[PDB]
């Protein structure tokens, strides 16, 4: 009843990742004067002001100066920003009366319907801002004489444990809910990021915790739990080398209870490397799923991208799975594939070519797309399928005349 183990292997090996960080309050960072963006400077400032707070509490007049100067800029920026809110409110009360501003209705594409039959239901007053964002969720086949949207997706994002805009624990949450009198869909995801050190206080060392849950009634009558803990550090082999490891646990709770049901355990690695003129990004994973009744099933997956200096326009990627079903001594089931892309410009048009190789069935798939924004010189190949249709028309018109 659990998903196939290739789903877990694909999910645990998808490239070199990068976690969520700290966001800075722009008026207090770079006190008063305008700033620019740089990751190391913001990451330095967030840990620097916590350190200066601890030293200022302990005594230390040089830290007290810095923390008081930050407090002065913080107060000035906050009062300026509430003044901007008051000015915007007065301007809105002048431009409209006691009336409100109204959104655009959603565009669902063409239909055999008058297309403003239900457009008055998606034009509403704004509310402006409350913290969360909502989008409607739509199905593939809607009802015939109505709008197709059925569910609501909520999104929230915050940074709770900060002192004065020097944050702690980036956090976000996403819930999809569809409720009616027949069914119930409830999906959810949460991420929490924890930062251990940034340079020059250390190297960049960040862990990330992800949780997710799946409820779908009355189809499944079991719920799905996943938990991922994964850790990244820049280094471990050389300067600025983005390494990371991680583990994943998953369960199908029977009746909703997370203490009973089949389980899945997996681990993953990522790395980058630069040797010669070849830069490579690789990741690998192993999953040890439990079956419904059969027991251990294990799988291996790996992905690689080989960047190349010379010929900087050729992209090439390689992928591998290995399957180990029971009777493991003679059921090793391999699979590997290759992918190449390139890109030209000719005849006033932009060409892109993609070559794909699956290597189990020895098939080569080539796909070229072109785009001419200048003329219709690219249509000379359109004479190729137009001939054969005629050869399938007269041959029909002969057989329809017999």
């Amino acid at each position: 009843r659990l998903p196939p183990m290739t789903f877990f292997v694909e999910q645990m090996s998808e490239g070199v990742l990068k976690p969520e960080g700290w966001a800075t309050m722009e008026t207090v960072a770079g006190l008063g004067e305008e700033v620019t963006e740089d990751e190391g400077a913001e990451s330095f400032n967030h840990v620097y002001y916590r350190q200066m707070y601890e030293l200022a509490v302990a005594g230390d007049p040089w830290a007290q100066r810095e923390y008081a100067a930050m407090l002065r800029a913080y107060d000035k920026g906050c009062e300026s920003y509430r003044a901007s809110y008051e000015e915007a409110d007065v301007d809105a009360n002048v431009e409209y009366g006691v009336e409100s501003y109204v959104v655009d209705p959603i565009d669902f594409g063409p239909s055999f319907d008058p297309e403003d039959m239900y457009s008055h239901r998606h034009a509403y007053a704004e509310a402006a801002d409350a913290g969360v964002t909502v989008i409607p969720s739509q199905d593939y086949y809607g009802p015939e004489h109505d709008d197709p949207l059925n569910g609501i997706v909520f999104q929230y994002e915050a940074q709770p444990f900060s002192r004065h805009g020097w944050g702690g624990v980036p956090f976000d949450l996403t819930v999809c809910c569809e409720k009616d009198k027949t069914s119930l869909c409830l999906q959810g995801e949460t991420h929490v990021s924890l930062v251990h050190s940034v340079p020059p206080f250390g190297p960049r060392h960040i862990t990330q915790v992800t949780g997710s849950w799946e409820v779908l009634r009355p189809n499944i009558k079991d719920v799905m739990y996943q938990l991922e803990v994964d850790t990244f550090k820049d280094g471990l082999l050389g300067k600025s080398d983005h390494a990371g490891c991680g583990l994943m646990l998953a369960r199908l709770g029977e009746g909703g209870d997370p203490r009973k049901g089949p389980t899945a355990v997996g681990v993953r690695l990522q790395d980058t490397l630069r040797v010669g003129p070849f830069k490579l990004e690789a990741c690998a994973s192993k999953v040890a799923v439990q079956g419904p009744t059969g027991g251990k099933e294990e799988g291996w997956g790996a992905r690689a991208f080989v960047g190349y200096d010379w010929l900087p326009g050729l992209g090439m990627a390689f992928d591998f799975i290995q399957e180990r079903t029971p009777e493991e001594g003679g059921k090793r089931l391999r699979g590997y594939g290759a992918n190449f892309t390139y890109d030209w410009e000719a005849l006033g048009a932009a060409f892109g070519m993609e070559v794909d190789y699956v290597a189990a069935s020895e098939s080569v798939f080539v796909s070229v797309n072109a785009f001419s924004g200048n003329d219709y010189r690219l249509g000379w190949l359109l004479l190729l399928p137009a001939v054969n249709y005629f050869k399938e028309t007269v041959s029909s018109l002969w057989a329809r005349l017999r």
């Binding site: 190297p203 390494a243 990371g244």
Partner: peptide
């Protein structure tokens, strides 16, 4: 094999710092 021991080589050397 490969992604059990070397999946703990990275875990042990990340524990070696913190």
């Amino acid at each position: 094999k490969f992604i059990f021991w070397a999946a703990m080589v990275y875990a042990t050397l990340y524990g070696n710092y913190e």
